Motif scaffolding. Structure first.
Motif, short mmCIF file in Angstrom:
data_model
loop_
_atom_site.label_atom_id
_atom_site.label_comp_id
_atom_site.label_asym_id
_atom_site.label_seq_id
_atom_site.Cartn_x
_atom_site.Cartn_y
_atom_site.Cartn_z
N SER A 283 -23.37 -11.30 16.83
CA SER A 283 -24.45 -10.34 16.60
C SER A 283 -25.37 -10.26 17.83
CB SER A 283 -25.25 -10.81 15.38
OG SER A 283 -25.98 -11.96 15.81
N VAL B 78 -23.42 -5.59 15.53
CA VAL B 78 -22.56 -6.62 14.94
C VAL B 78 -21.15 -6.29 15.41
CG1 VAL B 78 -21.50 -7.54 12.88
CG2 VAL B 78 -23.96 -7.04 12.90
N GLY C 67 -23.02 -11.18 9.95
CA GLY C 67 -23.58 -10.65 11.19
C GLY C 67 -24.99 -10.07 11.03
N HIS D 145 -27.62 -12.79 10.74
CA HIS D 145 -27.89 -13.34 12.06
C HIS D 145 -28.82 -12.41 12.81
CE1 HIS D 145 -25.59 -16.91 13.14
NE2 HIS D 145 -24.64 -16.48 12.32
N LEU D 146 -28.58 -11.12 12.65
CA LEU D 146 -29.37 -10.12 13.38
C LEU D 146 -30.83 -10.10 12.96
CD1 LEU D 146 -27.91 -6.49 13.75
CD2 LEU D 146 -28.54 -8.12 15.54
#
Length: 141
Positions: free
Chosen positions: A64, A80, A109, A112-113
């Motif tokens: 990401s 992502v 993803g 995480h972002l």
């Protein structure tokens, strides 16, 4: 609502399904007016990315990349990137479909972002997993 941009170099999973999972995840997260890009590519491309951005010369399942720039209220969350090649192997190892693995990787993803990381362990992993599990539950239902 949100602007989900899906780009496919690898195409075994339908574009509209990836778009829908991503839109549903953003909605379960309560986000409005953000931009998210999702790229489905191969092991060779994700490897270059892993090397360049994480100093790890090997393929992986998902990476990401936060951006964050804002234009009057519209905010670009970032990208992502998922390798279909690795996703297929994991799906094989885990005993589920490629679609299921890709869906799970999109959620992983996105979380995480939003700035969570499970690799630390401890409290952070706890919060990462609770959020990921919540979003998954919203995409199941």
């Amino acid at each position: 609502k949100n602007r989900v941009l899906v780009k496919l170099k690898k195409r075994k999973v339908r574009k509209d399904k990836i778009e829908k999972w991503a839109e549903l995840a953003l909605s379960a997260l309560g986000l409005n007016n953000v931009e998210l890009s999702v790229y489905i590519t191969d092991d060779q491309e994700i490897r270059e990315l892993n090397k360049t951005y994480r100093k790890k010369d090997k393929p992986t399942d998902v990476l990401s990349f936060p951006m964050g720039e804002e234009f009057g209220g519209y905010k670009i969350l970032g990208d992502v990137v998922i390798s279909q090649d690795t996703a297929e192997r994991q799906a094989r190892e885990l005993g589920h479909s490629l679609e299921e693995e890709v869906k799970r990787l999109i959620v992983h993803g996105i979380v995480h972002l939003l700035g969570y990381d499970h690799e630390k362990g401890g409290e952070e992993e706890k919060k990462f997993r609770e959020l990921e599990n919540y979003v998954l539950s919203k995409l199941s239902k």
